[PDB]
Amino acid sequence: SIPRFGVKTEQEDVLAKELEDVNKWGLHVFRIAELSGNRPLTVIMHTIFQERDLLKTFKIPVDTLITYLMTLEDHYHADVAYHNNIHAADVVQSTHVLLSTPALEAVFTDLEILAAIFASAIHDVDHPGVSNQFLINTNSELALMYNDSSVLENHHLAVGFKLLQEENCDIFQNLTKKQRQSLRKMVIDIVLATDMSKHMNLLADLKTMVETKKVTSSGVLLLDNYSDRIQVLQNMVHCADLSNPTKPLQLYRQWTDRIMEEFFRQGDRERERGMEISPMCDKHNASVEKSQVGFIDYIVHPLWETWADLVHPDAQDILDTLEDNREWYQSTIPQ
Numbered sequence: 258s259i260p261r262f263g264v265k266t267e268q269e270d271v272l273a274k275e276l277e278d279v280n281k282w283g284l285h286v287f288r289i290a291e292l293s294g295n296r297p298l299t300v301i302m303h304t305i306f307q308e309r310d311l312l313k314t315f316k317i318p319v320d321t322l323i324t325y326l327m328t329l330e331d332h333y334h335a336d337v338a339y340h341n342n343i344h345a346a347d348v349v350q351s352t353h354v355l356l357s358t359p360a361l362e363a364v365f366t367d368l369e370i371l372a373a374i375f376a377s378a379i380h381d382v383d384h385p386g387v388s389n390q391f392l393i394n395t396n397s398e399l400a401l402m403y404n405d406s407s408v409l410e411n412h413h414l415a416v417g418f419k420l421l422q423e424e425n426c427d428i429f430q431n432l433t434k435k436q437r438q439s440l441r442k443m444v445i446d447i448v449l450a451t452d453m454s455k456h457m458n459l460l461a462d463l464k465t466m467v468e469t470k471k472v473t474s475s476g477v478l479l480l481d482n483y484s485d486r487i488q489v490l491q492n493m494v495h496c497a498d499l500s501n502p503t504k505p506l507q508l509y510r511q512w513t514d515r516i517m518e519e520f521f522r523q524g525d526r527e528r529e530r531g532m533e534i535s536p537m538c539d540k541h542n543a544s545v546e547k548s549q550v551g552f553i554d555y556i557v558h559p560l561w562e563t564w565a566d567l568v569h570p571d572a573q574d575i576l577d578t579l580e581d582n583r584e585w586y587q588s589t590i591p592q
């Protein structure tokens with residue numbers, strides 16, 4: 258074998274070429290997971306941080322960043338089919354694309370950008386692949402600690418920040434206390450808003466925002482106060498989290514297979530424990546296609562429609578894709 262010396266390996270080259278689509282909706286995220294040796298979150302976060310010059314801006318040592326990223330990625334569960342490091346990388350990358358929408362040019366500070374991306378990276382870390390309700394009903398220690406209230410989402414935040422304390426992991430070591438307090442508050446506000454129980458209120462407020470919407474010649478959005486800025490950042494990451502149906506069908510179905518696998522597993526555990534089987538978790542009584550059409554009509558389309566308005570016309574193709582995917586699942590309901 259010939260030692261490599263200063264030139265990319267061929268796999269690393271194939272990976273680098275795939276990462277050329279980091280700014281595009283529909284990145285081959287599963288290919289990247291494989292090509293990186295199951296390091297999609299590390300490699301995608303690193304690319305995005307370099308692209309946005311965040312290492313220089315926040316004086317983040319490169320070895321510290323990579324060590325933290327690997328450590329964070331190591332705390333997503335390989336055995337969990339959907340809420341794993343690939344989902345995390347996908348939400349990071351989707352948020353990264355949404356941040357660069359023309360309607361949002363020059364709106365956000367570098368610290369706000371850092372908050373949205375870091376929030377996306379950590380938002381599901383240490384997910385056990387079961388719901389808050391399952392954790393509550395079993396009297397889990399986690400549910401006890403967090404008083405049955407946004408149990409997992411509190412946990413995701415606690416773990417994401419806690420991991421900064423591991424050896425050479427404090428990527429925020431050079432931020433001032435003011436910078437850290439601000440970042441921290443934003444990240445917390447964003448991740449706690451990913452609790453699906455908060456969706457309706459979150460959407461309600463986004464609608465209210467679109468109504469009173471203000472722009473400036475060129476048509477870029479105007480956002481004066483923390484309340485408006487964080488609202489947009491919350492809904493942005495929430496859209497990224499619910500972005501699977503807006504991706505090309507080939508990607509969307511892979512996400513659907515994975516979440517169903519994860520749900521059915523929870524249902525098998527509920528059944529064997531003699532518990533009521535949670536909605537959509539019963540593999541003996543599933544209607545996958547009906548359920549996706551319902552997911553889209555009642556949750557995903559309403560959200561994205563409202564986002565497309567806020568940033569009109571930036572999100573038109575994303576919305577078109579969503580509607581094509583809705584039609585595909587509709588036509589697949591076996592009747």
Ligand SMILES: O=[N+]([O-])c1cccc(-c2cc(Cc3ccncc3)cc3cccnc23)c1
Pocket residue numbers: 453501502512513516537548549551552
């Ligand atoms: O009938 N449905 O609405 C329905 C049925 C089956 C799957 C879903 C669904 C929920 C969530 C987000 C989520 C994750 C965990 N708990 C709640 C929501 C993400 C998904 C991603 C891809 C496909 N289905 C998804 C929705």
Ligand SMILES: [Mg+2]
Pocket residue numbers: 380381451452
């Ligand atoms: Mg979550």
Ligand SMILES: [Zn+2]
Pocket residue numbers: 344348380381498
């Ligand atoms: Zn998520």
